[PDB]
Amino acid sequence: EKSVVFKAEGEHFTDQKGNTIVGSGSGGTTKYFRIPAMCTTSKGTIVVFADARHNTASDQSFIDTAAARSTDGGKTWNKKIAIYNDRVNSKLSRVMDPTCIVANIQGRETILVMVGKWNNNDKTWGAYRDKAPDTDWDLVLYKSTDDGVTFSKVETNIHDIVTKNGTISAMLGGVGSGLQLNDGKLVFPVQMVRTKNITTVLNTSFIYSTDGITWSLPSGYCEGFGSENNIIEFNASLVNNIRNSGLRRSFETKDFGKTWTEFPPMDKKVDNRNHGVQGSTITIPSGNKLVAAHSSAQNKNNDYTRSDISLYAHNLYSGEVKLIDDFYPKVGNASGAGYSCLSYRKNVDKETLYVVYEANGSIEFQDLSRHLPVIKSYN
Numbered sequence: 525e526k527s528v529v530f531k532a533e534g535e536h537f538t539d540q541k542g543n544t545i546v547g548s549g550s551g552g553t554t555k556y557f558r559i560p561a562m563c564t565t566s567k568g569t570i571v572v573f574a575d576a577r578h579n580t581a582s583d584q585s586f587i588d589t590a591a592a593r594s595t596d597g598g599k600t601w602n603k604k605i606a607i608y609n610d611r612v613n614s615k616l617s618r619v620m621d622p623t624c625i626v627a628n629i630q631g632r633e634t635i636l637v638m639v640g641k642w643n644n645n646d647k648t649w650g651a652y653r654d655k656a657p658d659t660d661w662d663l664v665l666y667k668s669t670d671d672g673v674t675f676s677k678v679e680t681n682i683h684d685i686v687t688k689n690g691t692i693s694a695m696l697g698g699v700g701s702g703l704q705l706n707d708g709k710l711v712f713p714v715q716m717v718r719t720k721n722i723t724t725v726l727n728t729s730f731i732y733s734t735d736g737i738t739w740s741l742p743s744g745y746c747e748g749f750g751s752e753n754n755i756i757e758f759n760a761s762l763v764n765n766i767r768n769s770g771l772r773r774s775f776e777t778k779d780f781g782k783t784w785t786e787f788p789p790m791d792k793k794v795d796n797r798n799h800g801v802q803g804s805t806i807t808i809p810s811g812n813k814l815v816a817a818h819s820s821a822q823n824k825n826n827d828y829t830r831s832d833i834s835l836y837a838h839n840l841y842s843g844e845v846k847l848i849d850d851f852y853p854k855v856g857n858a859s860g861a862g863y864s865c866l867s868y869r870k871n872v873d874k875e876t877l878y879v880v881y882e883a884n885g886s887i888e889f890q891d892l893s894r895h896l897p898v899i900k901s902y903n
């Protein structure tokens with residue numbers, strides 16, 4: 525009823541030379557997977573990115589970005605590494621926390637994946653606020669134009685726009701999926717760690733692009749909260765849905781990121797309890813209306829176990845919220861649990877709703893398409 529995308533202590537990857545990557549999982553396997561991001565193409569192909577945390581679940585560890593590709597509706601997966609860390613520090617070199625977009629970029633169907641990159645930092649990224657930006661940090665972008673078979677680095681101006689801003693120590697995607705707007709614009713939700721002198725330590729915002737190469741930052745910022753976030757398009761607004769300890773937060777911008785105000789249909793509607801968790805938020809059409817589909821954890825133990833990863837529908841008109849499916853009704857592994865990513869498409873006349881999520885160090889997939897009539901009615 526599920527499939528396993530990446531099995532904890534059950535995968536072997538190879539490096540750029542073709543030599544095996546001996547992780548710390550039993551038999552030299554990759555120890556742990558975290559932070560899934562899924563993008564489905566017009567061909568029905570499913571690509572799932574995740575951190576391959578070869579040695580430990582820790583954020584501060586040796587990590588590559590794995591990619592799993594399914595052309596049979598999520599039954600089987602071909603796996604590889606999409607992005608290798610720089611291999612400076614065998615303990616700490618890492619690429620992590622993917623955000624993906626599937627888009628037609630001036631006609632060309634492309635999967636983009638953006639990850640943060642560190643080498644020698646031994647502490648969490650929010651600790652490094654002395655520089656503009658941190659010298660250990662980067663934010664890299666890879667593309668596939670062959671339906672997810674191969675990924676190549678995109679040379680961008682993302683590092684430059686962060687430096688020129690001068691008030692950002694580091695930036696990361698919002699985690700899970702970004703979006704292509706109706707007009708074609710590419711949008712990644714972002715998280716920012718501000719330089720020490722900025723009283724907000726954290727903010728949310730987005731970067732945008734037409735061609736995937738040259739990106740821009742808006743002049744304004746949204747409050748950070750727990751900073752992981754996704755954006756949806758709703759009329760002329762961009763609307764975010766942000767991790768927060770306790771009740772999730774949602775703001776709208778009507779001026780393309782200059783100012784943000786609370787968005788009542790989603791603000792404070794889902795409780796993730798202590799510490800918060802990443803959540804995935806997307807839209808699903810229902811006639812010429814929209815419904816937001818959202819996944820995050822109920823967290824019944826009020827801790828890092830992040831139990832009960834659940835799908836909700838948000839009525840974007842009335843503000844009602846309901847539980848559609850507690851699709852992972854289990855207590856997670858507090859080493860790292862709870863994260864998810866949704867993906868909706870209508871290809872021809874076939875609508876699909878998929879989810880991937882963290883399951884005891886593995887990444888699982890479910891086809892949630894049976895729930896579409898319920899979600900679509902929720903307008």
Ligand SMILES: CC(=O)N[C@H]1[C@H]([C@H](O)[C@H](O)CO)C[C@@H](C(=O)O)C[C@@H]1O
Nearest residue numbers: 559583620621648649650750860861
């Ligand atoms: C870059 C980084 O540290 N990201 C991590 C996140 C980060 O440490 C926090 O958001 C604080 O910046 C949190 C997190 C979790 O809560 O499970 C996992 C995620 O990989």
